[PDB]
């Protein structure tokens, strides 16, 4: 409220206030599977200039 | 001039009626010295018994609301206290 003027006897004035806050951030944990090629298996892939099928 | 002065009087005692501790310059000093029935003036502000846990709250005032009941009024400016009731 506005700020209460001092004269005389006074026992009501104004207040000021206070408040807090929780700030939360979550973190996710997520995955992929990917396929390919055994690693004993490339030497019968391996072709003139690449490597797979 | 001297009208005017005499008017200048009349308007100042009208204005200091509704005063509740006017600044009157007297010539004399007034003999009180009789410690009784001293107590009813327009000035002793306050009440006769007051508690120390009492509510005294202090607003803006419109008129002259001195020792008299007062109401809310909301009107830009804070709302204030007005003479009535």
């Known amino acids: 409220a506005n700020?209460?003027?001092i004269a005389n006897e006074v026992n009501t004035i104004s207040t000021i206030g206070?408040?807090?806050?929780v700030v939360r951030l979550n973190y996710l944990k997520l995955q992929y599977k990917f396929r390919?090629?055994?690693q004993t298996s490339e030497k019968f892939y391996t072709s003139?200039?690449?490597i797979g099928d | 001039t001297t009208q005017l002065v005499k008017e200048y009087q009349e308007k100042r005692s009208k204005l200091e009626k509704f005063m509740k501790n006017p600044q009157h310059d007297a010539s004399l000093l007034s003999?009180?010295?009789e410690f009784?029935?001293?107590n009813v003036e327009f000035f002793a502000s306050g009440g006769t018994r007051t508690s120390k846990f009492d509510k005294l709250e202090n607003h803006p005032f419109l008129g002259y609301p001195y020792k008299r009941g007062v109401k809310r009024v909301i009107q830009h400016y804070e709302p204030h206290?007005?003479?009535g009731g």
């Open chain 2, 31 to 33: 003999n009180s010295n």
């Open chain 1, 18 to 21: 206070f408040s807090s806050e």
């Open chain 2, 36 to 38: 009784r029935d001293k």
């Open chain 1, 48 to 50: 003139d200039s690449y």
């Open chain 1, 3 to 5: 700020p209460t003027t």
């Open chain 2, 81 to 83: 206290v007005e003479a």
């Open chain 1, 36 to 38: 390919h090629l055994k």
